[PDB]
Design a protein around this ligand. Sequence first.
Ligand SMILES: CCCCCCCCCCCCCCCCCC(=O)OC[C@H](COP(=O)(O)OCCN)OC(=O)CCCCCCCCCCCCCCCCC
Ligand SMILES: CCCCCCCCCCCCCCCCCC(=O)OC[C@H](COP(=O)(O)OCCN)OC(=O)CCCCCCCCCCCCCCCCC
Ligand SMILES: Nc1ncnc2c1ncn2[C@@H]1O[C@H](COP(=O)(O)O)[C@@H](O)[C@H]1O
Lengths: 120, 175, 63, 347, 98, 52, 320, 140, 80
Amino acid sequence: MMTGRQARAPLQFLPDEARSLPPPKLTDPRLAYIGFLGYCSGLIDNAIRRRPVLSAGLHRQFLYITSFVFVGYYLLKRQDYMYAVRDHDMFSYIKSHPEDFPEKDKKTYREVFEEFHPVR
Amino acid sequence: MMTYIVFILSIIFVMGFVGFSSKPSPIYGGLGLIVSGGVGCGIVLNFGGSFLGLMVFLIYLGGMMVVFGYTTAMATEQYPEVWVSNKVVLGTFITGLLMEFLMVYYVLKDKEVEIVFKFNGMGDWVIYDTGDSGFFSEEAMGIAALYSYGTWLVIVTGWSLLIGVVVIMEITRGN
Amino acid sequence: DAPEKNYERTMAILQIESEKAELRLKELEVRRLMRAKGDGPWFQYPTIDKALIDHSPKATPDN
Amino acid sequence: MNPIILIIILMTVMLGTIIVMISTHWLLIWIGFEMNMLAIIPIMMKKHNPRATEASTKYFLTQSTASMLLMMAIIINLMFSGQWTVMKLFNPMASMLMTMALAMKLGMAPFHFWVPEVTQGIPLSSGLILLTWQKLAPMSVLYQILPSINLDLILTLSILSITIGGWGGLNQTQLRKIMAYSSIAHMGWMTAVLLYNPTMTLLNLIIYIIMTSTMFTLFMANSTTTTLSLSHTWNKAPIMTILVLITLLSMGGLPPLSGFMPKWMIIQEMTKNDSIILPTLMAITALLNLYFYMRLTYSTALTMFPSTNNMKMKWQFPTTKRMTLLPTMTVLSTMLLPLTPILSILE
Amino acid sequence: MSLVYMNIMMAFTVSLTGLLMYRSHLMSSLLCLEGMMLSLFILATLMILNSHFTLASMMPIILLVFAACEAALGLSLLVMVSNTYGTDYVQNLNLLQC
Amino acid sequence: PFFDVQKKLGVDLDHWMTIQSAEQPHRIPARCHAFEKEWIECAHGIGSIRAE
Amino acid sequence: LQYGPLAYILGEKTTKKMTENSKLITVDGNICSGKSKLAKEVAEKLGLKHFPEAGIHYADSTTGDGKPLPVRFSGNCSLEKFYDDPKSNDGNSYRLQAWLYASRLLQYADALEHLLSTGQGVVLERSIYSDFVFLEAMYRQGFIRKQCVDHYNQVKKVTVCEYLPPHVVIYVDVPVSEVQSRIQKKGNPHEMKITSAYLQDIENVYKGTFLPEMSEKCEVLQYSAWEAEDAEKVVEDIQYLKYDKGPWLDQDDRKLHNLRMLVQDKLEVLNYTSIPVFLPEVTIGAHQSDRVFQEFTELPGRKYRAGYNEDVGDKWIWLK
Amino acid sequence: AKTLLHQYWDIPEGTECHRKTYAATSIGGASGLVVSAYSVALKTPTSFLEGVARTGRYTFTAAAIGAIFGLTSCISAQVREKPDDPLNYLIGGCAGGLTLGARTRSYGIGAAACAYMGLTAALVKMGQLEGWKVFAEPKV
Amino acid sequence: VAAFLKNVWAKEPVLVASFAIAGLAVILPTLSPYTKYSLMINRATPYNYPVPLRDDGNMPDVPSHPQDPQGPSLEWLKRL
Ligand SMILES: CCCCCCCCCCCCCCCCCC(=O)OC[C@H](COP(=O)(O)OCCN)OC(=O)CCCCCCCCCCCCCCCCC
Ligand SMILES: CCCCCCCCCCCCCCCCCC(=O)OC[C@H](COP(=O)(O)OCCN)OC(=O)CCCCCCCCCCCCCCCCC
Ligand SMILES: Nc1ncnc2c1ncn2[C@@H]1O[C@H](COP(=O)(O)O)[C@@H](O)[C@H]1O
């Protein structure tokens, strides 16, 4: 859809303009959900290899959590970047074309006649 | 009729394709494809394709010799069909011949034809160049630049031939 | 919770949701106009770059 | 096979798919498909039994026919456009022929007649590569020519793939033909939303690759080939029954699992364009895929089929198999739906 | 367009339908694939030599190379059919039906 | 997914065989050189939908 | 992990330790052929590793501490009650036969792993090529059915076609009367009930089915009763053989590498031992296997992976 | 044969009976030849006369479906004096279902074909009324 | 390196000559001064026409005639 925008900066994950946007918090609930995905990956990795699921591999579970948080933080940054570029392009296109988007006469209901349909 | 010389060589081309496309036996398939490939470098060589037509002659001669070796070695039955042994070979062979000469009769009558695309009936002497090419045939310079500009093309083609040899040695190992 | 608390919380929720609804309708109409025309920053399907063209004087002048 | 030769062959398969993905020239697209086929043939012939030779013969015939149609579409674009940019095709005849070529490379119906035979004949990892990595290059070429693809042809091929891959999986007790008709149905799912919004097509492609890699990785981790050999999993490794349960319920499109993510988004991009009938029929036809998924969960997890004696020895050994990324693929295949707006990274 | 393109596309369709309708013999379809590559070679080379676009004159050579670079593969995939079976018929290749 | 590696790394893999107006061996012109130059500079940047 | 494709790529070629001493040897014979000690003699003059005969509890001795597990966990069968009741209804016979073949397949896998990793030859007792002959005696005395023989031949067909026959296979000629006399002098109260035609059919399927196929794929050294008592006799007659037969000759590092990767995955070894072919002598139902498996979870050291058990006093589980 | 569906729908309902019946018969015959081609393709007939008898059987079956379908639809749309009404196509689809049951020599197939083909023809008439597009153009 | 060279020169001498000629043909064009003369001969060969330039007024190294002294010379080719 937006393939003409990301053709002057090819294969750049986060461009120079991506730093203008506020980053996700380190207490981001989406990043906390990805940390829970890391905790579940650690528990499944201790379950499929018949280990004590809550005790074996504290380093292993902690590296699963750290790896999913480290991937998911940059994925959330690219997510925020792409939705911000979408809204920026939308609003600049609306501003650039006044004759395509009329401002309606926002009437009140004392003139607007609705057809009533009684239940009986 | 002589101005249609590329047309006549192309009618022989389609006749060879009908000859080996009915699949009588790969011996006679090799015969029909040698005939079609040998007039392929009569079609394409009357454009200026000396080198680039001699290659499709030479590589396909090596190909049909190897194809002969395999259809003599593994793909051989007791009574190989010439063209007329099986009825289903000869029926579609005669069908291809009469359908090709049917469209020949339709293209030398109207001088225009349309199977899906549209094709003129005048000979392809009109579509040539009215210019000179100096001290070089242009296709020879183009295939000479396979070593100057085409670096990545040489790399991927050499790697494809290398792994094609390796792939074929991994397949014909049996274990 | 207080009735004023729930009431004004409801009004803030209605403001945020009405803004998101109007902007989703703007999103649909903007995508419709850009697929119809192609004048915007979206739907710029790639064509040939004009930097590839050799502008040097060639062999024959008829070009 | 010599492991150096196996590594070189896998790097050549990756090189062929990358040459399809990164090249701007039609001949390099064709060379990438030629390299991909030529280097995936020994992956189908790693164990040297006649079923693999039959599978590789049928696969080479279908992919060679598709390559011929692809090069004819390339030469017709060279006629009607005089150039070589991988962009929109400048002829509806060339667009039809390239759509046929890519449909034969994907195994979309009614060119689907090679996927269950070839997937049954070859081992599990080769079937995994055939059903995941071979769906990246023709979907890339379909992604790059979408202003020229005819609407009715690609929609016909898509919904026909969905219906026939739904019906074909009901009458198979073999796991690999089940995954093959699931592959036909899911390629129909991907290509049905291709011209409407192709980011959702890439989303469906990636979610299907994750789910299929989860399923084949579980099949390699338990060394199961049939439904009846998978039936003894609760006696061998009981957590694997939970894993195949949640993944088979993911691939059918049940919320709150991740396989409900592409399908619903597809409907989210097909009711926008005043097409209500076609995603409705797609949502109805998803129930067939979900039905033989429910059949496999009934056989494996939700009941207990009777086992045999020598399982008592296999209790005493842990699985020493390289279960590569299996918890990662499980978690990203079942618990991904609350991050549905991650799809913007594919825009 | 010109007259010779009709017959080269016709030879392509003839070798197509010869490939796309079998006769219980696989070498005769390897020959039909090589015929389709012949028609592709001649059609691309006619277009290139007509337009005098010389830089893609290396393109048919490469094309012809990949012809045998799959067709020899078929030969390696023929004998593995014909070492299992005494022939190379296509009705020996129906054990993947169950 | 058009991973544009050739514009990312700056390499020039196949942007030379792409058009008839590119850099040619010994400056051999094509018979549609002027028309293709006009069509490429006419339809650069304006996208496919407006360019058609 | 210890071995894989990476170590093969990094220079560990399996013919760097493939010397002339790498001789996998198997001593065949009847029940009391005087051979069970003789293998140890062949083990203690050639400097080779002796594996005992795989009974019910071979896998019990390999994994864990090695103590004999209870019979309801391993086999769920009997050899003594097989000798007392060969013609039982519940099928002790084929259940014990299939469990013994699984144990001998694990024994042969351990033999090939030790041989292909340590360079030392392994001396077995009644390897997997000499197992089906006992089945034939159990078919020639009416102890099992035809379907059990079909099931066992399918299992052995899908398991033995991925291995090699041994280098030297020793066979011992002891007649039936001397076997019976050593059984009577043994004093074993269950072993005495073995019928005579059972042993005669063991000898018949030895001489007519095993040796007409092994003599072309290995080397036979056929000894009688008296000459199988001298150690250096059989040891030196192994020591001066000309090895040309058998498929040990067309083995490079690649094929032996694929064999070693097949061997070191013991579940891949034992994958098609328990195939889902529903036969009433081996099919253990849902609740019975469920109860026995949940009791196997409660066995000490058997709940988790082999270094993750606090009940046996394992250290550093929270960093493993 | 898209133009066959054109010159079926390019004629107003309740006006011309035999031409609409011929167009519906031609559409049914084209569908029957498609089914005949795939039937002689994917399942080999043991004789060429076997194959052409199956081809003629499937052709006359789908042609009789299309014929009695369009005929009952046009006759009901005339004799009810309601041209744009889906109940006419409902009765026509049920007549085509009983046609398929009488040609397949089975009653339950005919009744199920009545019900589901009546639903199908109702959907066709409503999609022709409100302009429902099944292969809809991408526009937003 | 000498003992294995003698061994392979005893066993497979055609391969020794092959690898010797191949290695010298790889390494030796980087140790010869004549390669710049190769490139200059190849780019001093006028296939096309030496296209004239419009005299805008200020081109201090471009001649107006072939016998004008400014421009590239090829006396190095005739001496070498
Ligand atoms: C739209 C464009 C998007 C592009 C995204 C690109 C992402 C990377 C490429 C993904 C595509 C799949 C490529 C790999 C296919 C399988 C390769 C393979 O066969 O690997 C061999 C290996 C064998 O393992 P083992 O089970 O020990 O083998 C038994 C012996 N046959 O292992 C296996 O067979 C197990 C599976 C190995 C690969 C698993 C990981 C990749 C796919 C699952 C998703 C994992 C999450 C991270 C990446 C997300 C994006 C895909
Ligand atoms: C460096 C430049 C690039 C070099 C690579 C490209 C070379 C291009 C020329 C064509 C070569 C094609 C054929 C190459 C085959 C090599 C492999 C080979 O044949 O090895 C086997 C051979 C012993 O033969 P055997 O295995 O016993 O055969 C069975 C019965 N005949 O083993 C041998 O005969 C041993 C051969 C290796 C040792 C040769 C040493 C020659 C030294 C010459 C002087 C130094 C030159 C500098 C470069 C040295 C490079 C090593
Ligand atoms: N495959 C088999 N079937 C039946 N009995 C066996 C089998 N293998 C070994 N035995 C018995 O195992 C015992 C061997 O004990 P020993 O020879 O004293 O070590 C004898 O009673 C044999 O009959």
